[PDB]
Design an enzyme around this catalytic site. Structure first.
Site, mmCIF file in Angstrom:
data_model
loop_
_atom_site.group_PDB
_atom_site.id
_atom_site.type_symbol
_atom_site.label_atom_id
_atom_site.label_comp_id
_atom_site.label_asym_id
_atom_site.label_seq_id
_atom_site.Cartn_x
_atom_site.Cartn_y
_atom_site.Cartn_z
ATOM 1 N N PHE A 1 0.814 -1.223 0.000
ATOM 2 C CA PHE A 1 0.000 0.000 0.000
ATOM 3 C C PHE A 1 0.850 1.277 0.000
ATOM 4 O O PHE A 1 0.551 2.223 -0.736
ATOM 5 C CB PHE A 1 -0.930 0.026 1.212
ATOM 6 C CG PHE A 1 -2.355 -0.340 0.907
ATOM 7 C CD1 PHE A 1 -2.914 -1.495 1.434
ATOM 8 C CD2 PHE A 1 -3.149 0.491 0.120
ATOM 9 C CE1 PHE A 1 -4.226 -1.809 1.176
ATOM 10 C CE2 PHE A 1 -4.461 0.164 -0.144
ATOM 11 C CZ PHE A 1 -4.998 -0.981 0.385
ATOM 12 N N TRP B 1 -14.424 -2.076 4.099
ATOM 13 C CA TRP B 1 -13.295 -1.172 4.312
ATOM 14 C C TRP B 1 -13.327 0.072 3.434
ATOM 15 O O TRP B 1 -13.107 1.190 3.911
ATOM 16 C CB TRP B 1 -11.995 -1.921 4.056
ATOM 17 C CG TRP B 1 -10.779 -1.158 4.410
ATOM 18 C CD1 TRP B 1 -10.278 -0.948 5.665
ATOM 19 C CD2 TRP B 1 -9.878 -0.517 3.509
ATOM 20 N NE1 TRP B 1 -9.131 -0.210 5.599
ATOM 21 C CE2 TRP B 1 -8.855 0.061 4.284
ATOM 22 C CE3 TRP B 1 -9.826 -0.390 2.119
ATOM 23 C CZ2 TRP B 1 -7.788 0.757 3.717
ATOM 24 C CZ3 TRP B 1 -8.764 0.309 1.549
ATOM 25 C CH2 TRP B 1 -7.770 0.879 2.348
HETATM 26 C C1 LIG Z 1 -8.013 -5.494 -3.118
HETATM 27 C C2 LIG Z 1 -7.999 -4.260 -3.595
HETATM 28 C C3 LIG Z 1 -9.279 -3.569 -3.940
HETATM 29 C C4 LIG Z 1 -6.716 -3.523 -3.815
HETATM 30 C C5 LIG Z 1 -6.777 -2.161 -3.151
HETATM 31 C C6 LIG Z 1 -5.487 -1.412 -3.451
HETATM 32 N N1 LIG Z 1 -4.288 -2.155 -3.041
HETATM 33 C C7 LIG Z 1 -3.099 -1.463 -3.550
HETATM 34 C C8 LIG Z 1 -1.937 -2.049 -2.770
HETATM 35 C C9 LIG Z 1 -1.802 -3.533 -3.061
HETATM 36 C C10 LIG Z 1 -3.127 -4.291 -3.048
HETATM 37 C C11 LIG Z 1 -3.035 -5.609 -3.814
HETATM 38 C C12 LIG Z 1 -4.296 -3.510 -3.600
HETATM 39 C C13 LIG Z 1 -4.202 -3.362 -5.122
HETATM 40 C C14 LIG Z 1 -5.552 -4.258 -3.197
#
Ligand SMILES: C=C(C)[C@H]1CC[N@@H+]2CCC[C@H](C)[C@@]2(C)C1
Ligand SMILES: C=C(C)[C@H]1CC[N@@H+]2CCC[C@H](C)[C@@]2(C)C1
Ligand SMILES: [Mg+2]
Ligand SMILES: [Mg+2]
Ligand SMILES: [Mg+2]
Ligand SMILES: [Mg+2]
Ligand SMILES: [Mg+2]
Ligand SMILES: [Mg+2]
Lengths: 304, 304
Positions: free
Chosen positions: A74, A295
């Site tokens: 993240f 979330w």
């Molecule tokens: C499961 C998601 C909706 C993604 C939300 C954003 N993040 C960015 C950091 C790394 C994660 C895999 C994800 C892409 C998950």
């Protein structure tokens, strides 16, 4: 913005309080925040809270690895917004050998040694499943700076790409890792359709709640790294409506993918194809879909 | 199916029953129907009924002209499904100089002398307003057999193309003709955005209700002339869901266009920009949209 009905019931890991305080502290100790404000924002986003929503049935001794991995993934996803594609690729590529555990970390750079130390503890706990996460991760990392982000995309083209940039496989292998869920190559091939369908839900739900953040990013950060890449924008352009309208229409489609998920699952049971391992797996993908939505609705990361 | 609420109320022209017997009566007299089952099917479609829902505020001595034009365009629409793209083009292009009055019809070919006598009678009642319907018609005619039908399209490019194939422009000129509604060029320039938005609603609403009918046609008639070219197909592909799923999502997109219609009409009035002529027109468009939907959800044309 009112979400349409869902039959899904999100679950959260029982140890979310402890594990979040543990992993939060760690990053407040080792990571490089520009000021107190960014430190506060970080704790506010609740990166372990969301990990505990993705994998509520995670083994108790294993959930903390996932929080660690997803947290730094993240933190990096945000940093890449302020670089070019070249810069951003260079950044990621340096971390890949370190992740394999092949090159030692420069211990002066927090990101280098945080990643190194993470993967080592993971391989120490369970070498075999730990290793199965590595390629899905890299695949995601190389998608983050893929120049296709700067080419016009239609809805289908986009979802094909977002399956990598949203990190579908990496989330799947992390899930399997954190549960100790072992699946044969046979079983894994058997549910490729369910994966693909689920990937769209993860992508688009995220596109919907994070659009505002990303619109502002596309105005204020790097013209490449902060490029606006989202189903919200695509649909808005194609249907000639506002982003808010597009969000409401995409949310209904997300519910269709949920229904489609139940259908595929049911059908896979309508042959002997639903092994016990497979059953826990597709139950798992449902927690990811619903958890990520819960979330996304409540995190300060997206309402700012 | 289960349409979500609409703010639009349909209106039906008061003479609908007389004009229906009259125009139906004319085509039952002159059009070469193959057999009795098809003459019954023609009457059950209720083409004059849909015309009187499209233009419920048409002048009492003008509404029949409109029922005629649409009725013959409906009949030809069904014809081209048995033709190749080449045959259909050849068929429509015959009709174009006959509509203009530049060529005399073969009085032994009904479609030719019905078309010729229609336009001549319309030019007699209001020359300059009849004139302006011609090019929009030829534009929709040529769209009908454009090979872009058989090529991949995303949702956006489809709506662009369907604006011609749904005949939005001819419907506009026709509505004006029916109402004696003369608008200056600059007036028409002011509602261009409202026109385009209205186009999408007409297209996709028709697509939703006529899908099962077009499915079956694609499977039984000519592989070109009856090709499945529809937003329900395109959305189902891009998003990988069933056609029913796509319909449920497209319906929500249609209410978003009603909202945008209202927003654009309010914006126009909040400047000093909504002339009285324009006021009638955009109210006119709104009757087209809700009227098209009412007919579509009850006509036997789409339900059997
Ligand atoms: C499961 C998601 C909706 C993604 C939300 C954003 N993040 C960015 C950091 C790394 C994660 C895999 C994800 C892409 C998950
Ligand atoms: C306004 C519409 C949704 C269209 C319904 C079907 N018919 C077919 C024959 C020609 C008409 C203009 C139309 C395309 C109108
Ligand atoms: Mg990203
Ligand atoms: Mg991002
Ligand atoms: Mg996002
Ligand atoms: Mg047609
Ligand atoms: Mg048709
Ligand atoms: Mg249709």
């Amino acid at each position: 913005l009112e979400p349409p009905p869902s039959t899904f019931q999100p679950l959260c890991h029982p140890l979310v309080e402890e594990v979040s305080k543990e992993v939060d502290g760690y990053f407040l100790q080792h990571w490089n925040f520009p000021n107190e404000k960014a430190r506060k924002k970080f704790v506010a986003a609740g990166f372990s809270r969301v990990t505990c929503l993705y994998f509520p049935k995670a083994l108790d001794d294993r959930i903390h690895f996932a929080c660690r991995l997803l947290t730094v993934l993240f933190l990096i996803d945000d940093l890449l917004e302020y670089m070019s594609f070249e810069e951003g690729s260079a950044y990621n590529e340096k971390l890949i050998p370190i992740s394999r555990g092949d090159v030692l970390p420069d211990r002066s750079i927090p990101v280098e040694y945080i990643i190194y130390d993470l993967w080592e503890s993971m391989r120490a706990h369970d070498r075999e499943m730990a290793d199965e996460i590595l390629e899905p991760v890299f695949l995601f990392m190389r998608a983050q700076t893929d120049r296709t982000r700067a080419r016009p995309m239609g809805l289908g083209g986009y979802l094909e790409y977002r399956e990598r940039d949203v990190g579908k496989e990496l989330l799947a292998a992390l899930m399997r890792f954190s549960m100790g869920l072992k699946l044969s190559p046979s079983e894994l091939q058997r549910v490729r359709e369910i994966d693909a369908n689920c990937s769209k839900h993860l992508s688009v739900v995220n596109d919907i709640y994070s659009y505002e953040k990303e619109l502002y990013t596309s105005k204020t950060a790097h013209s490449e790294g902060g490029i606006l890449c989202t189903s919200v924008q695509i649909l808005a352009q194609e249907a000639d409506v506002t982003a808010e309208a597009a969000k409401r229409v995409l949310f209904v489609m997300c519910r269709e993918w949920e229904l489609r998920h139940q259908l595929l699952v049911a059908r896979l049971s309508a042959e002997g194809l639903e092994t016990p391992g497979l059953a826990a797996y597709v139950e798992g993908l449902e927690y990811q879909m619903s958890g990520a939505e819960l979330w996304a609705q409540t995190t300060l990361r997206y309402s700012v």
